[PDB]
């Protein structure tokens, strides 16, 4: 059949849309078709569609969502010898292929940047019970930042960043690390409604470098993930297992970098 199942958290976040293009770009060349499963549109309580999809007889699965459990994977895919690869919000056990990006180092770079701009009181805005990759950004951030950090939990979404703004306005913080660019966009909107300026009132740094970063005002300083390349590499490694099932388990980490734009400024 030459079918690959792709399970992502959503397709509305430009991050996961570009992941899919990355994958599609590799699959097209080999006449594989992409079965799309974004978990957000499975509205059942116990992910009935996901559990039924993971049991289809496809040639391989890309798993980027933590909603597929290690137990499920063992009883369906390892038991049936259906190759798969994990990334992003799906944590690797270590007996599979996986492609990570360097979340820990990204958090370090974000911290280093706010320190270079002399911010001493900062907020990190992130979801509760965060996926491990996301948690690593906070961990990397706190590995090098030794001044006052406050955590605000909010939904991993534009509405989430928006709904965090009232709490931020009650604090003494001057710099904000938004754990993804969508949160940062939410911040922008909420801060604008409050008549607060960026970066004059708040310095903000995002994460991902989605295309919209250059179209918001001011352009958003962020940590770039190589998402197109993550999608290409992920598909490439999966098709390699499909063609030689017994190859060794491979786990690569792709690098990240700071993209400085106009959304931070030195504390004056």
Ligand X SMILES: OC[C@H]1O[C@H](O)[C@H](O)[C@@H]1O
Applying CB under 8 A, the residues found at the interface with its own copies are 3, 10-12, 14, 17-18, 20-21, 24-25, 28-29, 31, 33-38, 40-43, 49, 52-53, 56, 158, 185-186, 188-189, 192, 211-212, 214-217, 219
The 3-class secondary structure across the chain, one letter per residue, is: CCEEEEEECCCCCHHHHHHHHHHHHHHHHCCCEEEEEEHHHCCCCCCHHHHHHCCCCCCEEEECCCCCCHHHHHHHHHHHCCCEEEECCCCCCCCCEEEEECHHHHHHHHHHHHHHCCCCEEEEEECCCCCHHHHHHHHHHHHHCCCEEEEEECCCCHHHHHHHHHHHHCCCCCEEEECCHHHHHHHHHHHHHCCCCCCCCCEEEEEECCHHHHCCCCCCEEEECCHHHHHHHHHHHHHHHHHCCCCCCCEEEECCEEECCCCCCCCC
Determine the residue with CB nearest ligand X: 180
Among 123, 208, 221, 264, binds ligand X (CB under 6 A): 208
Q: Which of the listed partners (ligand X, its own copies, none) does 11 bind, with a CB threshold of 5 to 8 Å by partner kind?
A: its own copies
20 binds, among ligand X, its own copies, none (CB under 5 to 8 A by kind): its own copies
Binder of ligand X out of 18, 65, 133, 233 (CB under 6 A) = 133
Tell me, by CB under 6 A, how many residues bind ligand X: 11
Q: Does 67 bind ligand X (CB under 6 A)?
A: no
Residue 66 sits in the site that holds ligand X (CB under 6 A): no
Q: Determine, following the binding rule CB under 6 A, whether residue 234 of this chain makes contact with ligand X.
A: no
Interface with ligand X (CB under 6 A), residue from 180, 209, 221, 263: 180
Q: Which is nearer to ligand X, 141 or 207 (CB)?
A: 207
Positions touching ligand X (CB under 6 A) are 13, 15, 88-89, 131, 133-134, 180, 182, 207-208
């Amino acid at each position: 059949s030459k079918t690959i199942g792709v399970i992502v958290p959503d397709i509305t976040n430009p991050f996961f849309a570009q992941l899919i293009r990355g994958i599609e770009s590799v699959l097209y060349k080999e006449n594989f078709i992409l079965i799309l499963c974004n978990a957000d549109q499975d509205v059942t309580r116990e992910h009935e569609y996901l559990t039924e999809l993971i049991r289809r007889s496809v040639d391989g699965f890309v798993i980027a969502s933590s909603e597929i459990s290690n137990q499920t994977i063992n009883e369906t895919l390892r038991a049936k010898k259906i190759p798969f690869i994990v990334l992003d919000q799906k944590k690797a056990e270590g007996f599979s292929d996986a492609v990570l990006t360097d979340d820990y180092r990204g958090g370090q770079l974000a911290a280093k940047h706010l320190q270079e701009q002399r911010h001493e009181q900062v907020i990190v805005v992130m979801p509760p019970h965060a996926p491990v990759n996301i948690q690593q950004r906070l961990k990397g951030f706190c590995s090098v930042y030794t001044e006052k950090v406050q955590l605000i939990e909010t939904e991993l979404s534009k509405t989430g960043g928006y709904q965090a703004v009232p709490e931020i306005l009650k604090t003494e913080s001057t710099g904000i690390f938004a754990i993804n660019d969508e949160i940062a966009f939410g911040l922008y909107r909420g801060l604008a409604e409050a008549g607060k300026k960026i970066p004059e009132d708040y310095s903000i740094i995002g994460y991902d470098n989605v295309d919209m970063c250059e179209y918001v005002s001011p352009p958003l300083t962020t940590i770039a993930q190589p998402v197109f390349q993550l999608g290409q590499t992920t598909a490439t490694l999966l098709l390699e297992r499909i063609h030689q099932p017994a190859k060794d388990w491979e786990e690569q980490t792709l690098p990240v970098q700071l993209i400085e734009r106009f959304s931070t400024a030195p504390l004056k």
